[PDB]
Amino acid sequence: MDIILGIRVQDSVILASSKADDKTRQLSPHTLMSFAGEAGDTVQFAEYIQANIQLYSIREDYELSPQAVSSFVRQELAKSIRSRRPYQVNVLIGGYDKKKNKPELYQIDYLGTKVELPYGAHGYSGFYTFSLLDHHYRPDMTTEEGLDLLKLCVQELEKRMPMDFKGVIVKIVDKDGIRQVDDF
């Protein structure tokens, strides 16, 4: 399975990740990454990223912007491919920029391709999520509208793939940092 979904809202980022380890790492008090791919390389790459951002946060007594963690993640993803055949990896970074009060969302491919997004997905999806998102998506969408859009999006994914994916874990980054939210 290994699906990741994203529905950033007016004052949050909502990361939905497949139920199985979460495969989504708290990088800081206001940053999540979600990742999908070849299960050995991605889990170990995510822990390398987490240990480097935890080391920065301890060494500074400070937060690292959702941009700076994302460009660090792309630079280390690209630097890990300069002696290697590309491993299947996709990264979906969502965080809250506490020096500008904006939620932010980024996608990184296996080649190291940053894109700054309204919404995103990987791993187990086609145009059915992207069409359903683009019809309903709004710049000022509320967190409750976002959770309903994510429920529509998970329902569309469930209807097209009736096997058991055991639901998904949803997590929110906002002013109050990481909240794990129960949804079904």
């Binding site: 080649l111 190291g112 391709t113």
Partner: protein, 186 residues
């Protein structure tokens, strides 16, 4: 994120131009020198990081900005370094000699062979539709406003006329003491 895309470059009387596909510009700048890169988006961004680094260090070490022809030798010698596994790109440098005032455009293969056409340059997949349009519309020694007109109509005409709702183009028009970035939509 879209891989490939096109860049176009063109000379006028004391001015240059760099058109490109939007819908993340392909076209970066390092002071008065502009670099449109087509190809894999990861290599476009890795080259932006690499040339930003090299050119900031140049400005620091040398007390002046990197000129268009010097930047051409730097991009080709940097790209050549990657000889056995290159950057999947078509770079297009542009810029107006700050000490001469002469227009400059050049472009390269993935390991840095220098084209230096005095009229126009193309890069990206399906170049040769635009190469015909650009050879049809170009004339020597234009003013900046006509130079904008010829490059923008080249982009529009060679554009996929079936998907013009997905369109968007950035045209940098570059002059001696002035740069104007026009975004352009239909």
């Amino acid at each position: 994120s879209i891989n490939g895309g096109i860049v176009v470059a063109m000379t006028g009387k004391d001015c240059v131009a760099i058109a490109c596909d939007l819908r993340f510009e392909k076209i970066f700048h390092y002071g008065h020198v502009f670099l449109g890169i087509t190809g894999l988006a990861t290599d476009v961004t890795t080259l932006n990081e690499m040339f930003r680094y090299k050119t900031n260090l140049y400005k620091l070490k040398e007390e002046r900005a990197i000129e268009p022809e010097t930047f051409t030798q730097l991009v080709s010698s940097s790209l050549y370094e990657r000889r056995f596994g290159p950057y999947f790109v078509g770079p297009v440098v542009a810029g107006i000699n700050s000490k001469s005032g002469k227009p400059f455009i050049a472009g390269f293969d993935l390991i840095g062979c220098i084209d230096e056409a005095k009229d126009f340059i193309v890069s990206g997949t399906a170049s040769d539709q635009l190469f015909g349009m650009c050879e049809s519309l170009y004339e020597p020694n234009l003013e900046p406003e006509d130079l904008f007109e010829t490059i923008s109509q080249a982009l529009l005409n060679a554009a996929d006329r079936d998907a013009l709702s997905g369109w968007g183009a950035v045209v940098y028009i570059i002059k001696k003491d002035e740069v104007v970035k026009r975004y352009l939509k239909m």
